[PDB]
Amino acid sequence: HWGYGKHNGPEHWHKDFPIAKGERQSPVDIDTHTAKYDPSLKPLSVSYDQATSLRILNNGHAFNVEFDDSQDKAVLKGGPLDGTYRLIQFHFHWGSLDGQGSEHTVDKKKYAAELHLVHWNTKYGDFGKAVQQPDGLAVLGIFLKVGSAKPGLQKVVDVLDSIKTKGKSADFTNFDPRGLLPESLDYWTYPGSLTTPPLLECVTWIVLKEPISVSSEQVLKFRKLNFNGEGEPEELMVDNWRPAQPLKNRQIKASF
Numbered sequence: 001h002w003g004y005g006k007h008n009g010p011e012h013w014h015k016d017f018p019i020a021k022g023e024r025q026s027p028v029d030i031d032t033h034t035a036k037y038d039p040s041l042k043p044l045s046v047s048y049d050q051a052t053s054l055r056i057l058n059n060g061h062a063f064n065v066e067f068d069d070s071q072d073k074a075v076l077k078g079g080p081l082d083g084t085y086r087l088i089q090f091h092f093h094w095g096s097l098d099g100q101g102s103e104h105t106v107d108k109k110k111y112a113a114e115l116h117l118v119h120w121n122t123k124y125g126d127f128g129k130a131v132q133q134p135d136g137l138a139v140l141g142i143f144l145k146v147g148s149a150k151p152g153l154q155k156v157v158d159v160l161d162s163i164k165t166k167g168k169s170a171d172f173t174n175f176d177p178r179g180l181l182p183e184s185l186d187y188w189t190y191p192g193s194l195t196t197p198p199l200l201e202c203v204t205w206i207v208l209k210e211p212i213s214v215s216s217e218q219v220l221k222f223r224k225l226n227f228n229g230e231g232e233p234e235e236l237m238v239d240n241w242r243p244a245q246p247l248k249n250r251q252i253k254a255s256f
């Protein structure tokens, strides 16, 4: 099945998922001099105070911190969005080295990693229905660079030991995602897709301009995770990022 290696990676995905070569694929390069400020954008509203995390899972591609979305608690609204989008999970994409790891790029610059906070449109009742809609998902993307530690990331870092291999999960309650956010909510936005198979074109991307800093020791622990399952040969979970895809005349709008 699909992965990030030479024989199952992003170059191969189109065979099982033809939409890989579609009209609104993600990620993309954000060309800052082509992106236009949009006065019609309303302020972005990220309300994570009432968020309820349940557990963390190694799914053999990345790790997901999953949230209880059976009530309107952690919500993303405003900006380019119409209505209310509920937080369901977050995960990261990262590299084997600090010079790569992000999926979106900024004037071709690759960051050390990228956080995706995934939200579904409440008008569609549940996540599975939303991913069948052009405006079913909103993903908040945040770049990570290596420098000072991110205190609010440490609880995640410390639990990775318990989920080394594919299929492992651990209880992960009372994690506050507010501690992963940069100061500024300045962002670029474009219509796109999931960056993993099934690559569905259901996402409004909201990519923050300001990166968060994480320590070298924090990212190093990300790189200790395994793609493989328990008792299998060790395949380090690194470079789990899809490269930039063709923009195809889409317009990236800036909030600033």
Ligand SMILES: CC1(C)CC(NC(=S)Nc2ccc(S(N)(=O)=O)cc2Cl)CC(C)(C)N1O
Residues within 6 Å of the ligand: 089, 116, 118, 127, 128, 131, 139, 193, 194, 195, 196, 197, 198
């Ligand atoms: C839609 C559902 C229920 C979950 C899907 N899981 C997804 S779409 N995981 C996922 C994969 C990639 C992203 S990303 N990188 O675009 O933020 C975000 C998410 Cl939630 C997989 C499929 C569509 C087969 N089923 O199981």
Ligand SMILES: [Hg+2]
Residues within 6 Å of the ligand: 131, 132, 133, 134, 135, 136, 200, 201, 202, 203
């Ligand atoms: Hg869709």
Ligand SMILES: [Zn+2]
Residues within 6 Å of the ligand: 091, 092, 093, 116, 195
């Ligand atoms: Zn992602």
